[PDB]
Amino acid sequence: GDTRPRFLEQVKHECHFFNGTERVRFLDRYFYHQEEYVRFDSDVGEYRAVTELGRPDAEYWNSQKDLLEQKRAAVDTYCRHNYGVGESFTVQRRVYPEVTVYPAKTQPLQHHNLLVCSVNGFYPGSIEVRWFRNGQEEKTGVVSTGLIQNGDWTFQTLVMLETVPRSGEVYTCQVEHPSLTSPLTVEWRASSADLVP
Amino acid sequence: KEEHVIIQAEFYLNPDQSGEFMFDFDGDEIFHVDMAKKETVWRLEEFGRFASFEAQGALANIAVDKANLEIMTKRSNYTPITNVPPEVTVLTNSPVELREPNVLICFIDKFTPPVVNVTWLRNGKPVTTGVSETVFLPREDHLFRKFHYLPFLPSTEDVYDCRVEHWGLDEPLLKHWEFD
C-alpha cells in the first residue's frame, strides 16, 4: 500500500454569534496538520502568529492595508450576512422528538430492570430528559448515551433508569426541548408488562 | 456564551492532491462543493430552496490552500502529519423493530489525516447498494469526523459490520451490529 508521508493544510473562517447577531466574533485561522499557525481575530483587529511557523505571514499580511480593512469588515460582510441568509433553516430549525419508552429486557416485576427512554430525530441539540416514578423525579440510577449527532441535522439520546418495578407503578419520561409548544411525557405502566402475575 | 457558530472549513492534502470546501453550523454540514463537478451540494435538499453559493469560488480558495501547503511544508522541513486513528461507533437511527425499515450509522471520529476507507458489511460481504456518506467534517481539535449510512430491513438472520481502515490503525477496525 501507500504509506508515503502526508502534509495537511486547513483553513477555518469562523463566525461566532452572541445574542442573535448583537455581538459577532470573526476568526480567520490557518493550520498545518492540527497546528494553528496564524490567526486574525476581530477582537484584536490584525493577524497574530500563533506559532513560529506563522510569523512570516502575520507581518506580511498586516502590512497590507486593504487586506486588513477587508478582514475588519468581515463581521458584517461575511458573518452577519451569512447568518441572515441561513437563519430560517439553521438558527430557526426545530424538529420535534419521537419518544419511545420500553424496558431493556423482558423481566418479571419485582426484579431489576433498565427502563429506556429513546428520544430520536430532534433538533437543536439542547434537551432535558427526566425520569419520574409515580410522579417523583428519579435522579440516581440514570444513565445516558449523552447527545448523539446523527450527521443529518438530527440528534438522538437514550436515557435509561435502573429500577425494580412493582405492580401499579407508573414511570414517566419527560422531554423539554425548544420544539415543544406543550409538554411531552411518555408513560410506562408496570402492570402493562406483568410477565408473571 | 455564544449561541451559534458558522465555519467555512477547507483543507488540501499532499501528496493525494485532495481538497475539501464546506460550511458547518453548530457542528452540522450546510453544504460542500464537489470540486470535480464544480457543484454546490446541500446537505439537506431543502437548504438550497432559498440559499445559493457560487461553487467556482471554492476552486479559487483550494488553489490558495495548495500554494499555502507548499510553503508550510517547506517551512516545517517536511514535518509530516502524525496519524491519529479513528474511534468508531455503530448506531441505529431509531429503535429497532423486526421488518420495520431503519438505518445503520457508522460514526468515524477523532482522526487525521482525512483519508479513510469505510465499508459496510452484511454477513461479511461488502454492501455497495443504498449506501451513502458524508464528506470529512471538522472538529474543534482540528481532527475530523465522518458518517456512513446503510438503510436496512431488520431481521434475526443478518449481521452487520462497519469496517474502517486508516493509516493510524494496526489492522482493519470492525464495529458490529446485530438484532437484539
Binding site: 480567520d28 505571514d57 506580511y60 477587508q70 461575511y78 441568509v85 | 467555512q8 445559493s52 500554494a67 510553503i71
Partner: peptide, 15 residues
C-alpha cells in the same frame, strides 16, 4: 440569497 465566501490569504514565499 447568496452565501458569501471568505477569501484565503496567500502565505509569504519568504525565500
Amino acid at each position: 440569497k447568496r452565501i458569501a465566501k471568505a477569501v484565503n490569504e496567500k502565505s509569504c514565499n519568504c525565500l
